Each structure stands twice: as C-alpha cells, then as structure tokens.
Design a protein around this ligand. Structure first.
Ligand SMILES: Nc1nc2c(ncn2[C@@H]2O[C@H](COP(=O)(O)OP(=O)(O)OP(=O)(O)O)[C@@H](O)[C@H]2O)c(=O)[nH]1
Ligand SMILES: Nc1nc2c(ncn2[C@@H]2O[C@H](COP(=O)(O)OP(=O)(O)OP(=O)(O)O)[C@@H](O)[C@H]2O)c(=O)[nH]1
Ligand SMILES: Nc1nc2c(ncn2[C@@H]2O[C@H](COP(=O)(O)OP(=O)(O)O)[C@@H](O)[C@H]2O)c(=O)[nH]1
Ligand SMILES: Nc1nc2c(ncn2[C@@H]2O[C@H](COP(=O)(O)OP(=O)(O)O)[C@@H](O)[C@H]2O)c(=O)[nH]1
Ligand SMILES: [Mg+2]
Ligand SMILES: [Mg+2]
Lengths: 430, 45, 427, 427, 430
C-alpha cells in the first residue's frame, strides 16, 4: 500500500508538522484521541481496536517544543516514544547539531525509522520538514539524511525546507547555516522544495488580508500544500500522480531538484462569495508571481518543468483548456529544450478547511510546483551574504570549537558555486 | 480493504454518460452551443 | 468460435478497457452480476469471442488486467461492471513505474511479466482458436507503455501467427499531460513497429474536439473520452460477435489495410455522433453517415486527413441497409476528391456490411483509415524527442534503470525511418 | 423537386424570414413543432422545395440564418415557429457589424464566410436538383448588406448556373433609420448588379402607406410589415410548391421580365389587400383584382409607376380562375394607357395561373413589375451619396477596415451608369 | 454574449454610480445583498450559486466617498477589492491626478479591469464616468483612458463626462482642468457624451418642478439616460442599437465626437396623469432646448447627426412619422450635406421607476443623443475663460510644482483651439 514517513527536524519542522497533522485528522475523520467514529493508510497506522497512530517522528534537541505536543490536545494521537527529545538545543549552530550533540540522538532516530519501516508494507517516500536557518534543522537534518540514504538506497525523499528571506532574518547565522545545510541537500535528497517566510507573509497580507500574521497562519496553509501534494495516494481521481512520479517529471538533471511552490486559491471567508471560482482563473492565479511561496520573480528566469496538482470538481477538459491559455501568454517563459513542460493531476476530493482557519471552503484547488531557472537568484543572495561574513571570519569560532574546522566552509561554498553555474548553463539557450 | 472513492464530478442536468447521446435516447435536451461556441441555449435576450 | 485475448495495461489501458467492457457487455445484454438478460438469440450466438463459459451460466470475460499501481486495479473493481473480471487475471505490482519507460520494461517489469505471461497462456490455451490479441495502453506513460510493449514482444515470439490489435493513446502535440511524453512514445514506437501487427492511434485532443463540436457536450469528463474509444473497439470486431452480409474479421482488415508491414498505424472515427438537441432534426441515411464519415472533425486522431493521401481506408457498416448505397458512396467519395486518395493503389476505400447495429441505433459505421497524414503526428513527437535528447534532459532516470545511450539513438533512427516511408509514398 | 435554398442575413433579414417560414409552413400545414397537419394531399406533394424530410415525420427547412449580433437569433428562437430550423444552420459570429458595410464585408467577413459556405454547400449537395437561392436582406444596414453581398458574390462563383432571388429593403426618401444609408446602399447595389440574377426592391415607406390606406391597420408593427413581404415570397414560388394550369417557376419569370442583364430590379405588389371592414363589400373578381394590381399605391416600392414606362411586368394569378380575364384584363391595361408602357415591346405585361389559392382566400395574385420609374429611387440615393462623399462625411469609419476611396468612386460610377441606362430606354 | 464594463472615476463618478447601480438592480430584480429571487450579463456576472457581482470599478483617490459605498446599503453587492481607494485626494489638481499621486493607483486599477476582461466572454465597450472640473476626474480619467487604449485597442470606450457651466461653477480652477483633460479626451475616447449641471438644474426646476434639487436628484435622471441607451443590449426590441452602432453613425469626423444628450418624459408623479404622452409629442419635446442636458442653444448650430432611443410601447410607424415632422420643421436645422440626419432605436421594455425617486412611472421615453455644431459654443466659452486666467498666469504654480512643466498648457490650448475651427469648418456650407 501507499506508505510515507514524515520526519520533522528542528522547531520549524515540529511547528509545521503540528499544523500538518492538524489537517490530516480532519480530512480522514480522525478524532484527536485517535479513534475514528482505507484512505488513512498513507499517514496513519491501524492499531488493534479503533486506534490510529501517525507515521511520523517529532525529533528535536530542544525539549520545550516537543513537550508542547506531549501536553497538548494531541497527547493521545502520537506514539509516546516517537516524540524524540534531547537535553539541550543546538543553539543555532550547524557544528553542534551535526557533530557533538546530534550524534547520540540520531542513533535513536534510525531505530525509530526501522520500526516504522517494518510496519509499513511498501514505503514510497520520506517527507522531511526542517529549516536551513537553524542549527538543529540543518546540523541534525543533514545527519539524518546521510544515514537514511545508505540505509534506504534508490528510495525517494522529498525536502520541504524553509530558507531565509532577503529582508527578514530572525537570526544572524542563517547564511552560515543554509550554506552548510545545502551541501547535503544535493546528493542525498531527490526532491527539494524551496520555502520562504516573507513570501508567505506577503500572501497572508494580500490574499488573506490579515494585517499581522503569526507563524500559525503560515503553518496552516503550508499544510494545505503538503496535503494537496499527497492527495493522490489517499484519494483517487482522473489522473493520479505518485510520489515516485514527481522525480521523473521534475528532476531533469541530478543536481537540479529544487522547486518552487504555489497554492493557487487562497481566499478568505467573505471574499469567496463574491469571487467566481473557475478552473481557468485559478490556473491564471497559480502563475501570478505574488502567489509564489518563495520570494522570487519567475519572470527573471525560465520554467524548466511544472506539475499541476488539481483538486476538487475539475473536469479534465477545463485544465486542458487552462493549460493552453497558459502557454499562449508571453509573460511566462519556458526553456527551449522542453516543449512538453506540464504535469497535470486531478483529484476528486476538495480540500477540507479547519474550523477557525483563514482559508474558506473552496470547491476547486490547484497546487503549483515548478522547476525553474529563476531559483538561481535565491541561492545567489545566500551565496553573497555568506561570503561577506566569511571575509572577516565572523561567527567561525563557534563552528571551529565543536568538531568542524575551517576547511568545511570552503567546500560548502564551492559546491554552491557549482550549483550557481549549473542553473546558468542549463537555462542558457543552445 | 481498498481506497476512498469520492464522487466523480457531474456538470449539470444529470448527464451520467454518453448513453443517451450514443444510443439515441432522451433527445431534445440542452446543448453547449447552437451558434458561436461561446453562447449557450436559455442564455441571451 | 474465433477468440481474441483482451489485455489492459497501465492507468490509461485499465480505465479505457473498464469502460470498454461495460459497452460490449451492455451490447450483449449481460448484467453486471454476470448472467444473461437479453431478449435475442443473436446476442448469445457468439459470446465466446469475449466471454468464457462458467458454472451457473456466468460469462467471465477474456480480460487480463496488468499494471503497477494497486490503486488502478482497486479502481476497476470498485466501479460498476467490475465484478465480472476474475481475480486470477488481476496481476499487479506495488512499486509503480512513475512514467518511466526504462523502469516498466527492464528493471521492474521482469518480476511481473513472468506472472502475466502465465496468465495470458492460461487464457490462450483454454480456447480452441486464437484470432488475435487486443491490448489497450498509451504511449506517453511508463506503466502501460514500457510494460505493455514488453508484453507485445514476448507474446509475438511465442504466438507468431496471431493478430495483434493495439489501441494506443499517443501524446498530444497541443497539450502535454506529462513531461516525458516524447521519451516514452518514441521508445514505445521503436518496439511496436516490428511486433504489433495492427496499431491503433488515439489521442485526447481529438476526443475533446468531438465532444465539443459535434457532440456539443458541456462537461466532457474523463470517462466520456473512453466511451467513444469503447465504441471504436466494439465496431472493429462486429463481424466476429454478430453475423453480417459481408464478413470482415481482424485478418480481413489486416490484409486490406496494410500495404507494407511497417505501415500499420491506423486512425478511426465513429460515424453517427450528434448532439442531443440535434437528434430529431437529422435524417439518418447512408449518404448522411458517409458525409460525416469522411469529415476531418469526426476522426479520433488529431492528424489532418486533408494533408496526406489515404493509402487504404476501411469501413464497417452496421445495420440493415442497401448494399450498393454503402458501395456507391465509397465510389462517390473516390471521385469527388481523388487527389485525397493515393493513385498507385486504385479503389482505396472499401467497406463491409453487418446487419446487427448497436443498441438504439438504426445505422452506424466504423471507419478505419491507413493514411500517410499520420506522419505529421509522429514527427511532432520526433521533433520533441530530438529537442530533449541533445541536452540529455530527464534522462538519468532512464539510464539508472539499465538503458544505454544507444537505445535512444535507435529509437530516433526508426522513428525518422517510419516518417520517411510515409513521406516517400506521399510523393 | 426544384429545390430552393433560403438564406437570411442581418437583423432585418432574420425577421423577414421568420415570418416567411411561418407563412409558407401554414400554407403547407406544418405546425410549429414540426409535424404535418394539412387536410390536402397536394400540400405534401411538393414539400421538397422548402423542407427536408427527417426521421419521425419531422420537416426541417432549407434555411440558413446568418447575422453578427446574437440578439436577433434570440428573437427568432423565442418567437413562434422558431424551433423548426436546424440547430446546425444557426451560423453567425459575436462581434456585431455595427451598421458598417466595410466591417460586414472585409474584416469579420473573412472568418464568418468560411463557415457559412460549409453550411450552404451541405444544403445544396443534399438535394438532387437546385432551382436557385432565395436570400433576404436590407440595403440600409451593414449586417445583411455587406455580409450578404459577400455571400452572394461568393455563392455565384460556386453555382453560376442557378438563379439568385434576392429581397432588399432599400432606404426611404422621407425618413432614415440609419445615418449611413446612402453609404450602405450604393456599395450594396454596386455588388448586386453583377452577382444577383434579379432583385425585388422593397421598402418600408411603401409598406407603411399600404398598411394605412388599403389595410387601414391601426398599429402596423414590423411583424405586420414582415407578413406583407412574406406573402409575396410564397406567391412567387406558388407554381413550384403547387401544380398549376400555366406553370411559371423562378426561371420562367427571369427570362420574361429581364431584357438586359443590368436591368433586374423590380417593383412588387400583392393584389387582394383588403381592410377588415371592407371584406364583405369587395367582390373578389379578376377585373377588380387587375385595377388593384396596377394601382400605384398598391406597389410595395416607393417609386411611382406613373413617372416612368413599364418595360416588362408579370402577374402570378392564384386560384380557380379562367384565362380570358387573365388575358383580356392584361390586354385592357395596355390599351387603356399605352403611354405608360415601352413601345418596342408588344404586350409588355405578363401573366400565369396556378389553380391552388392561399389558405382561406378565394382569388389571389402577385405582381412583379420591371419599370424605368425606379430610376429616381437610385437617383435619390446617388444624390444623397455625392453630397456626403464630397465632404467625406462618415468615411473615417469605413476606411478603417480597409476600404480605399477608389472603391467608393467606383460604386458611385455604377450608380450613374445604372440610372442613365433606365433613362436611356425611357426616352 | 454582450457585456459592458462601467468605470467610475472621482466623486462625481461614484455618486452617479451610486445612482446607476441603484437603477440596474431594478430592471433585473437584484436585491442589495446580491441574490436574485438572464439578461443581467451586460452588468452582472453569475458567481457561484445565486450571487451576482456588478461589472464595475469604483476608483477614487479620496477615501471619503468609496467607504460610503462600503458602509452603505450596497455593502454585500460589490466585491471589496473591486472598489479602489487611495490615501489622499487630488485637491482639484490635474498634475496630482496625472503625474504625482496618480501612477501608484492606476497600476492597481489595470489589474482589475484585466480580471473583469478575462471573466467576460465578448466585450462590447467600456462606459467611463468622470467630471473634468476636478483633478481626480480629469487627471485619473486622462490616465485611465490612455491605458485602456494601449491595452484594449479599437474597443468602443463610450464616455459620459460632466463639464463646467457658464453661470454656475463649483471650483475656481475648473477651466484649467477642463482644457487639459479635453486634449487627452480627443485622441482616446471614441464616443463622449456632454453633460452640464446647470441645464439639469433648469430641467429639475421647469419639468420635474423641484425648487432645491440636490446632487442625488441630478444623478437619478442621469442614470436613466445611461440605462436607456444600454437597454438595447439588455432587452430585445424592434430596432436594436449596440455600442458599436453609435460610433459608426454619430461620429462624422474622428475629432468631432462630442454628442449632446436629452431625455423625454422627465415628468413628476402628479404631472404624469394629466400629460398625454404620445410618440409625436415626446419627440417634439426631446428636441426642445428645455430638455437638453447641456446649457447650449441648439438653434445656433446645425444637427449633423441625431440618434433617438425609444423605450416602451412605441409602434414603429409613429416614430417613423415623428422623423418627418422634425425634419419638415424650419426651427430644427440640419447641415446641408447630411439628409439622413436621424437614427431610430426602439426597445420593448419601459423604463423602471426608482422607488422613492422623483420620476414617475412612464410607458414611453426617448433618449435623444445628437451630434451638433453648437458644442463649439461651449468650447468657445471654456477657451475664453482659460485665456483670461492664463494671461496673468494664475493658479499655475500648483500645477507646475507637481510634475508638469509650462509647455503642456500651451499645447493643450492649441489642440483645443483647433477644435472650434473644426466645428466652424464642418458647419459652414459648401
Ligand atoms: N514556516 C515556519 N517557519 C518557522 C516557524 N518557526 C520557526 N521557523 C523558521 O525557523 C527559523 C528558526 O530556526 P530553526 O531551524 O527553527 O531552529 P532549530 O531547528 O530549532 O535549531 P535550534 O534553535 O538551535 O534548536 C526561523 O528563521 C524561521 O524562519 C514556523 O512556525 N513556521
Ligand atoms: N452630476 C453630478 N456632478 C457632480 C456630483 N458631485 C460632484 N459633481 C461635479 O464634479 C465636479 C468635480 O468632480 P470630481 O473630479 O469627481 O471631484 P473629486 O473626485 O472629489 O476630485 P478632488 O476634489 O480633487 O478629490 C464638481 O465640480 C461637481 O460639479 C454629483 O453627485 N452629480
Ligand atoms: N482518453 C483517455 N486518455 C487517458 C486515460 N487515462 C490516461 N490517459 C492519457 O494517458 C496519459 C498518461 O498516461 P499514464 O496513465 O500515466 O500511463 P501509465 O504509466 O501506463 O499509467 C495522459 O496523457 C492521458 O491523456 C483515459 O481513461 N482516457
Ligand atoms: N420589414 C421589416 N423591416 C425591418 C425589420 N427590422 C429592421 N427593418 C428595416 O431594416 C432597416 C435597418 O437595417 P438593419 O436591420 O440595421 O440591417 P442590418 O445591418 O443587416 O442589420 C430599417 O430601415 C428597417 O426598416 C423588420 O422586422 N421588418
Ligand atoms: Mg530550536
Ligand atoms: Mg475630492
């Protein structure tokens, strides 16, 4: 059966996953204790008599974010010993989370992975949730993905990593942590999905018209992106898209696997009655640059490949009609060597809305994830800011003391240089 | 033991399939267009 | 007493065949439970072509469902007319090809085809006379294209004197549903030209045009496209299932429609397609269906028949009708546009008559056309493959499953050779 | 079996044919649903001329409705007898002509006229033998004038051996419904002289005077005006739809009435027009039918017959009538006023008898007159054209679509040539 | 399908629009919430299930008039993002409306017509409402017509525009804004309709018999003029006229497109019973100068082309007789080169009375739109007062400070100067 294991690393992994698992219970009717009053098999495990346990581990060195789940309203849904904790956090240091304090915890993590892998019959992928800005999500996140690749070869892994914003930075050593984190994201993860905070901040102020959004509002709609992506394994439709289907259609080159994300219909409550929800205009809203979940302009680069995760009552003619109008517009640009650039997937269940959420009930939904050459500027601003602080050797003595030495900054830098020339050479016309 | 099957979308008038359209039954129903493809019957002046 | 074994491959093949098996069961009057409830003895006269006798009067179809994703085989058993198929024919995998032609053929397909070949050998040896094999798949996929063409290779080397009707949905030049459409299609054609005896070409944008222009359907859904394809496949074998004045089985159309062995790709449209608001206005006569038969919009292939001359055309008329009215209309279309037909094969279009029409139809016809106009469709796939192969994009998934660079060059080789031979006879 | 294919063009053309198919079906007995309810065998004897037989007894007219504004197809469909037309024959566009001849002929005509000829050639090739085409339009507008003359010029190239019976609503001297009436008329008449085989000139101001002087109608609507022209159009083809003593079809009147190819414009009148009060007083006899036939006010064209000499006139008598009063009254109208007739033609007037009268009326007749008095109608519009053309009023719109100033000069040059030819034989 | 997009700029535009969209709901039974209890496609788009949203935009720099729509009885009818607001008003400065504080709103504006453009199938024209007396109506009006010309070419933008009266004016700087806005109005607007406040003040005093009219009572009969000429697209008639019908029949020269307006039975409640309203009587009353929307005497000029739009129980013979009576009359004088001076338009639906309004229920009404040579007397009036203030260079430092240079006033003066020779040349006999 369709089985996926979602690992959650760092505080941003837990907070996104806590909102992600909030949406999963409402879609499949699971009461928060874990008693339902065969779609549950993708994310939940049958357990004895009327009990369902999630196929996830909430691992974080910081105890206070995990302990919120233990004392929260989902104390009985999760397995008590899946929620791996630690003594002290990584203190936003890649060196601590990967070498010193993350070594004794990652061995307990792979023991949890093996028991969850033996329970599932056919495992289809790993959804890793972390942020490259922090020490735990980068240091322990790279450590977890190293052991998972050797333990499980040729098996797909999807990376939903939150990257620093150009204007908003909640910590100082985020450019240092992201460069070290992205060293592992190339050779280990087969699909990486870029995320950014200030872009989702810009969506909430305009589309959701909320004036001061919090992290909870950001986490609730990124959950809708995950649930729209995995909806084909749970709910069937006209054109199903597997998890293993994503790698063949969106990764043309082995080192090119970073993808933007976009959820097209994002409409508040009173807005929806006046708005005409149609297949054509939602597809047009999907490609609109302010609907990107990552702070980037798609007009700067050219689209390499795209996948359209349609949901709800969508006839396959209308998506065929909508895609044709998308190709005709000159405002977007496709790369010259890829005439067949669109993946379409239709699911027949509309996305459920959580009570009290900002999103309103919509009959149709389109999740837009594309591989683009415009993603190169997102790595460039992190590359340039990294070299500014590394020029005068700032915040290095923290990394020097705990395991790492001065060399590993150079190989992490020049691997991003190989990434930067990869996007420019491939996107160039031949 | 299976998969959740949501209802496949039906547009209007309960057209379950091409049974009437092929096998020549239930004639005289509404169509998508009669003139230019944009217009439709019961819509107009 | 002529039997054909039906095999469905991939999501495209399983969904089309499930709607196909609904129509011929409805035409033969058997309930989804599996008994017989028709009112005619002609329906029960020839059911062995599609159905095997079972205990208690159950009529199990000669269908073998083979795929990778278990959700697809769970979909056909959940829907109506899904209990007719035997579970011993439900051979399936777990991994899923993921639209990878190399994965569905070389690496993963080896562990499944040995199970499929045992099942199709069981259905073949049960019946006395094998007329042929009828398979349904697509070309842009990886489950029904990579593994489906593997079945064609293994079943032809073991049954070399039997027919092979493949109903394949080619990628659309106008719209792309997947990103690896020309990679899978050119590799599938590379296997189909030497193995498949008769290949049928379908495509989604031609089905969408018929449902909007002629049929005038507001919301042509995913299953509506399969119903017209189902009407095609019930029309090809109308001679086997029902008596007719002039008989035309699969081998009858094989020797007629195929001048040279490499040129076997055909294209078929169904004749009496009208909108629900225009049924009572049209008069159904033999000239009326013939004019609709030769129109370009009524064809279920996006190749424009006005561009290329027809090498050979076949028509399968169904119902009680005057035989020369069918015949003189073929002579009428041979004289009005003789340039649209080929010269060195005189009297291209030739027809057949069956006196049993489909249910609710006074008159119908199934038109099979072997035209050189299909070469513009294949070069559209060919030019997309050449554009992608020069940069080797989306290629490391194929070479990770054991496909060397030579197989892509040979796939482009005979693809250009195939469109060369079609262009050579157009001159 | 002498078929006529009917085309309606523009807002006025759709409305005049809406009442036309209402009248001719009431004569033949077809209800608004489509079935036959007549009480005579002779009504169904000749229905092929205007209707196509369909499955189940349904009759569909040989009518093609064309325009550019979808408001009028909403008007004909919502009106009575609007469901009888073929839904496939509802060919038109969405842009709207906007009463511009250049837009109706050049810009949107390219996309529209390609689809319309497909419908027309379908109607023509369906029937065994063609008699001609009966089109109806106006000359003051742009939706039926520019688009219709584009159709007429294109259909005469395709079918040069078949006649073209056109009905034109020309602009009024007293009033003007559109500001660009001289621009629309002079370009349309420039196209009608070489394409249309004969034209029957109609106009509202003569119909308005008839609706008030003879008919004494309190509120003459456009539905009232449409029935007067439509009553003619049934009476012109009365010898085709019905057997007659002296048959005169649409080619019989063509060679009789037309001396020279440029002179093919007629002034038309329907004879037995009575008010509701004066139904009992007027005795329906032929000699009093002849004096109403030759009354100047009963002519449905504004040109006064007293000003110019008649070249050739024809009468289509209907009913149980004997043929001296058919001939002596047409002889008496010569000798009573011989100055009003052309000298070099002996017996200018003409007549023919059909023994089937219209519904509920005993005697009826339809008058066609080709007189030189219609020159002042063309002289006035040419006078109105040269006044506007010198100042180039309302021309920046017409030159926007791509009409150069040379074509307006050539259109006016043909008007002065045509008005001089009528004056040439008047002397 | 037929549909028109209504655009309302400025406080004059919104207040007419409040009276306009009050009227359009009455012919189609739309309640203020927006639920009908299919001729509405010209103004309303069917959204979702049983909700209609107007095909309009309410854009204004001053927020004090757009929020009155938001807080008024029509809160639920209009889409909230459809109504466009601004931080600060133009303060009757054309330079502010065109250069400084106008560019930041027009970018948001053009994204909103575009979404109404994609929602609608086949567009017939744009109905733009503005007043040249104010900086918002002039400045933003001049910008908006220019952007619609380069985006939607050859689409008939049919305009209604309010002009300063000679006797009564509400602002000192009206002649500067009127001349500047007219220069953009020649080259952009295909069909413009002349409106003047003081003539309607005389109309309210003489015909409707109101001693103190207000701006609300003015716009109520103005909206009747808008609804009557567009009623042909909404409801079928004997002789229908479209938006494209007006431009090809009432515009003799590309710069002579300034058509007058007049209405028929402008009759109060108690006056309606005693009045014998017949087709001949209402045509004669249409061409009287008392019923003219603009304070200019038509007897001084020659009617180049006039269009009559009849609504109600109009037999086509009586309108055909009324054409002959006007042309035979010596007082109404036409130009010598246009014998076909009239166009008739008959619609079958009588005008709908606004409940609580001053107009009465009337069977028959005529909207008289005429292209005359007496419009040049209005433009000779505005040319004289513009030269009076410009000689001493008064109220110019407000304009040249906010972006403009001195040169724009002279070129606008010369461009408007050529109009009165053009109206004299077209009126002179030859
Ligand atoms: N989308 C989303 N991002 C978050 C959320 N909370 C924190 N983040 C991101 O996470 C970053 C903070 O660094 P983390 O990766 O969370 O730190 P960590 O993994 O806990 O490592 P330590 O703090 O050393 O234990 C911030 O810059 C945010 O961008 C959240 O609730 N939603
Ligand atoms: N017919 C009519 N005219 C009005 C109405 N309200 C204002 N006007 C006229 O419109 C002129 C100014 O128009 P606008 O440009 O819209 O004024 P504005 O939008 O407030 O521009 P600013 O004052 O610069 O903000 C005034 O001189 C009035 O004569 C109204 O309700 N009806
Ligand atoms: N007409 C029709 N086309 C289909 C159907 N299912 C899939 N397709 C086409 O097949 C292509 C996708 O192939 P896919 O299902 O992935 O092939 P697979 O790898 O064998 O499962 C798309 O272009 C669809 O247009 C169907 O039921 N009817
Ligand atoms: N008899 C009759 N004449 C009509 C009718 N409708 C319009 N007309 C005439 O048509 C002329 C206007 O032409 P128009 O309809 O604009 O032509 P178009 O551009 O082809 O639509 C007017 O002089 C009317 O008298 C009708 O229903 N009956
Ligand atoms: Mg932390
Ligand atoms: Mg203001």
């Amino acid at each position: 059966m369709r089985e996926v294991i979602s690992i959650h690393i760092g505080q941003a992994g837990i907070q996104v996953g806590n909102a992600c698992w909030e949406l999963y219970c409402l879609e499949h009717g699971i009461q928060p204790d874990g008693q339902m009053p065969d779609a549950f098999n993708t994310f939940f495990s049958e357990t004895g008599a009327g009990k369902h346990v999630p196929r996830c581990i909430f691992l974080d060195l910081e105890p206070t974010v995990v302990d919120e789940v233990r004392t929260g309203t989902y104390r009985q849904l999760f397995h008590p010993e899946q929620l791996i904790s630690g003594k002290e956090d990584a203190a936003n240091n890649f060196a601590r989370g990967h070498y010193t304090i993350g070594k004794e915890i990652v061995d307990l993590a792979l023991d949890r992975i093996r028991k969850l892998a033996d329970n599932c019959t056919g495992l289809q992928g790993f959804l890793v949730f972390n942020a490259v800005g922090g020490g735990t999500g980068s240091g322990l996140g790279s450590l977890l993905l190293e052991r998972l690749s050797v333990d499980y070869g040729k098996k797909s892994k999807l990376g939903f990593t939150v990257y620093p914003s150009p204007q908003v930075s909640t910590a100082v050593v985020e450019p240092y942590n992201s460069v070290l984190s992205t060293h592992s994201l190339l050779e280990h993860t087969d699909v990486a999905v870029m995320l950014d905070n200030e872009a989702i901040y810009d969506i909430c102020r305009r589309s959701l018209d909320i004036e001061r959004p919090t992290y909870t509002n950001l986490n609730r709609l990124i959950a809708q992106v995950i649930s729209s992506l995995t909806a084909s394994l749970r709910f069937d439709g006209a054109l199903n898209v597997d998890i293993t289907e994503f790698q063949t259609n969106l990764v043309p080159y082995p080192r090119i696997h970073f993808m933007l994300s976009s959820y097209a219909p994002i409409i508040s409550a009173e807005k929806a009655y006046h708005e005409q929800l149609s297949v054509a205009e939602i597809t047009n809203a999907a490609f609109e640059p302010a609907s990107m979940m990552v702070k980037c302009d798609p007009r700067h680069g050219k689209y390499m490949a795209c996948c359209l995760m349609y949901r709800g009552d969508v006839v396959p003619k209308d998506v065929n009609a909508s895609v044709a109008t998308i190709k005709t517009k000159r405002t977007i640009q496709f790369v010259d060597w890829c005439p067949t650039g669109f993946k379409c997937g239709i699911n027949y269940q509309p996305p459920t809305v959580v009570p009290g959420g900002d999103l309103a009930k919509v009959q149709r939904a389109v999740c837009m994830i594309s591989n683009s050459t415009a993603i190169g500027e997102i790595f460039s601003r992190l590359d340039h800011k990294f070299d500014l602080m590394y020029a005068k050797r700032a915040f290095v003595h923290w990394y020097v003391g705990e395991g790492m030495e001065e060399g590993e900054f150079s190989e992490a830098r020049e691997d991003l240089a190989a990434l930067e020339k990869d996007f420019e050479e491939v996107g160039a016309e031949s | 033991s299976g998969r959740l099957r949501p209802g496949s979308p039906r547009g209007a008038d309960g057209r379950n399939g091409l049974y009437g359209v092929l096998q020549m039954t239930e004639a005289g129903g509404t169509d998508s267009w009669v003139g230019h493809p944009q217009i439709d019957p019961t819509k107009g002046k | 007493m002529r039997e054909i074994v039906h095999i469905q491959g991939g999501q495209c093949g399983n969904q089309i065949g499930a709607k196909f098996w609904e129509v011929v069961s409805d035409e033969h009057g058997i309930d989804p439970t599996g008994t017989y409830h028709g009112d005619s003895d002609l329906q029960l006269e020839r059911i062995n072509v599609y159905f095997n006798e079972a205990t208690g009067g159950r009529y199990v179809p000669r269908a073998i469902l083979m795929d990778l994703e278990p959700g697809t085989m769970d979909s056909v058993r959940s829907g109506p007319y899904g209990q007719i198929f035997r579970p011993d024919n439900f051979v399936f995998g777990q991994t899923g090809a993921g639209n990878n032609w190399a994965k569905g053929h070389y690496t993963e397909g080896a562990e499944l085809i040995d199970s499929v070949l045992d099942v199709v050998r069981k259905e073949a040896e049960s019946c006395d006379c094998l007329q042929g094999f009828q398979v349904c798949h697509s070309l842009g996929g990886g489950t029904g294209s990579g593994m489906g063409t593997l079945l064609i290779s293994k079943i032809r080397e073991e049954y070399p004197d039997r027919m092979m009707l493949t109903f394949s949905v080619v990628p659309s030049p106008k719209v792309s549903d997947t990103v690896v459409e020309p990679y899978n299609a050119t590799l599938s054609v590379h296997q189909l030209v030497e193995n498949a005896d008769e290949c049928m070409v379908l495509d989604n944008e031609a089905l969408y045009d018929i449902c909007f222009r002629t049929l005038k359907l507001t919301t042509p859904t995913f299953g509506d496209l399969n119903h017209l394809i189902s009407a095609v496949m019930s029309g090809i074998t109308c001679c086997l299932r029902f008596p007719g004045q002039l008989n035309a089985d699969l081998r009858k159309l094989a020797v007629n429609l195929i001048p040279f062995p490499r040129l076997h790709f055909f294209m078929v449209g169904f004749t009496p397609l009208t909108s629900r608001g225009s049924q009572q206005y049209r008069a159904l006569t033999v000239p009326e269906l013939t004019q609709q038969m030769w129109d370009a919009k009524n064809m279920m292939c996006a190749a424009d028949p006005r561009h290329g001359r027809y090498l050979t055309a076949s028509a399968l008329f169904r119902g009680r009708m005057s035989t020369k009215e069918v015949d003189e209309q073929m002579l009428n279309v041979q004289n009005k546009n003789s340039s649209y037909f080929v010269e060195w094969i005189p009297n291209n279009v030739k027809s057949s008559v069956c006196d049993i029409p489909p249910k609710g139809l006074k008159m119908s016809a199934t038109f099979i056309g072997n035209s050189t106009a299909i070469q513009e469709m294949f070069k559209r796939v060919s030019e997309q493959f050449t554009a992608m192969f020069r940069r080797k994009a989306f290629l490391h998934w194929y070479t990770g499953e054991g496909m060397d660079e030579m197989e892509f060059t040979e796939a482009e080789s005979n693809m250009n050779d195939l469109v060369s031979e079609y262009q050579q006879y157009q001159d």
